[PDB]
Design a protein around this ligand. Structure first.
Ligand SMILES: CCCCCCCCCCCCCCCC(=O)O
Ligand SMILES: CCCCCCCCCCCCCCCC(=O)O
Ligand SMILES: CCCCCCCCCCCCCCCC(=O)O
Ligand SMILES: CCCCCCCCCCCCCCCC(=O)O
Length: 264
């Protein structure tokens, strides 16, 4: 019954996590000190690193939660689960930043070329990492069974994190991507040959972000606390992990391969 769906989806999650390790390692290798004169390369490398950490963290979590969590595979297990959620949050924030950068590259092209700071991406990434680390430190300091545990404070932290994500990251990313789509459609499709590639890649990015990345967020930060019966909460959690791992493994294909002008 449910114990078969759980194990099969966990096996799928492990497989896509390992594929994500391979892909993100290749992307990291291909972006070292070079192929970064393009303003669209710092974000991709940072996203690859964050996705690699996130997929490694689920790989470890799935390996550890198989064997009994008696006394020694529990503290490290929760540590790397917190690491996984931190990396997931920073990856979602990086996706939002990438979409906003792509939108601004066409909404304000003169500013993007002759006025954007050469290191704007660098400190935006640094600020995103710092904010994600601070928020996840708050989350772990109020929700961990080891560090410091509470019910009301943990619920409040989860609620504020869910509000932040679902009211900043999803609206900003969706509006930026749809503004890019509409601007290209209503400004370039009429004059030149229709940019079919741009439309299809933008739609694929939005679709994969909406139906693959959010499930884990909407489960962990919302569906966890709402009173839901068991034997179905496991299914939601496992579907969320599989969708998020698929999204993180497909990010290198949809962001680096589509946009590999330099490596061509
Ligand atoms: C207020 C809470 C935190 C909100 C963080 C939002 C992160 C995504 C939006 C800004 C990122 C992209 C900024 C411009 C990037 C560029 O054009 O190089
Ligand atoms: C962190 C992201 C910051 C984004 C700031 C956007 C700057 C826009 C500046 C005004 C538009 C300049 C180019 C068009 C000029 C015009 O309107 O005629
Ligand atoms: C876990 C906390 C980490 C905090 C700092 C993380 C910084 C990640 C890397 C940001 C900059 C990447 C390289 C930029 C190079 C450049 O364009 O000069
Ligand atoms: C560099 C970014 C910040 C990283 C650290 C974030 C804060 C750590 C977690 C909070 C620990 C203490 C929380 C309050 C404890 C209490 O009120 O009993």
């Amino acid at each position: 019954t449910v114990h078969t769906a759980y194990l099969v989806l966990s096996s799928l999650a492990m497989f896509t996590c390992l594929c994500g390790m391979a892909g993100n390692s290749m992307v990291i290798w291909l972006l070292g000190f070079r192929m970064h004169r393009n303003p669209f390369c710092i974000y991709i490398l940072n996203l690859a690193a964050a996705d690699l950490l996130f997929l490694f963290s689920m790989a470890s979590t799935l390996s550890l939660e198989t064997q009994p969590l008696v006394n020694t595979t529990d503290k490290v297990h929760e540590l790397m689960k917190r690491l996984m959620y931190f990396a997931y949050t920073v990856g979602l924030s990086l996706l939002t930043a990438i979409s906003t950068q792509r939108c601004l590259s066409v909404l304000f092209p003169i500013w993007f070329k002759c006025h954007r700071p050469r290191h704007l991406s660098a400190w935006v990434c640094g600020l995103l990492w710092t904010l994600c680390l601070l928020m996840n430190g708050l989350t772990s300091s109020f929700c961990s069974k080891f560090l410091k545990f509470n019910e009301d404070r943990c619920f409040r932290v989860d609620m504020v994190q869910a509000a932040l994500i679902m009211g900043v990251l999803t609206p900003v990313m969706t509006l930026s991507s749809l503004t890019l789509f509409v601007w290209v459609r209503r400004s370039s499709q009429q004059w030149r040959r229709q940019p079919t590639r741009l439309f299809v890649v933008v739609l694929a990015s939005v679709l994969v972000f909406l139906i693959c990345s959010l499930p884990l967020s909407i489960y962990w930060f919302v569906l966890y606390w709402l009173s839901l019966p068991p034997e179905m909460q496991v299914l939601c959690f496992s579907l969320s992990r599989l969708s998020s791992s698929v999204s993180s493994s497909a990010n290198p294909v949809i962001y680096f391969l589509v946009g590999s002008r330099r490596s061509h």
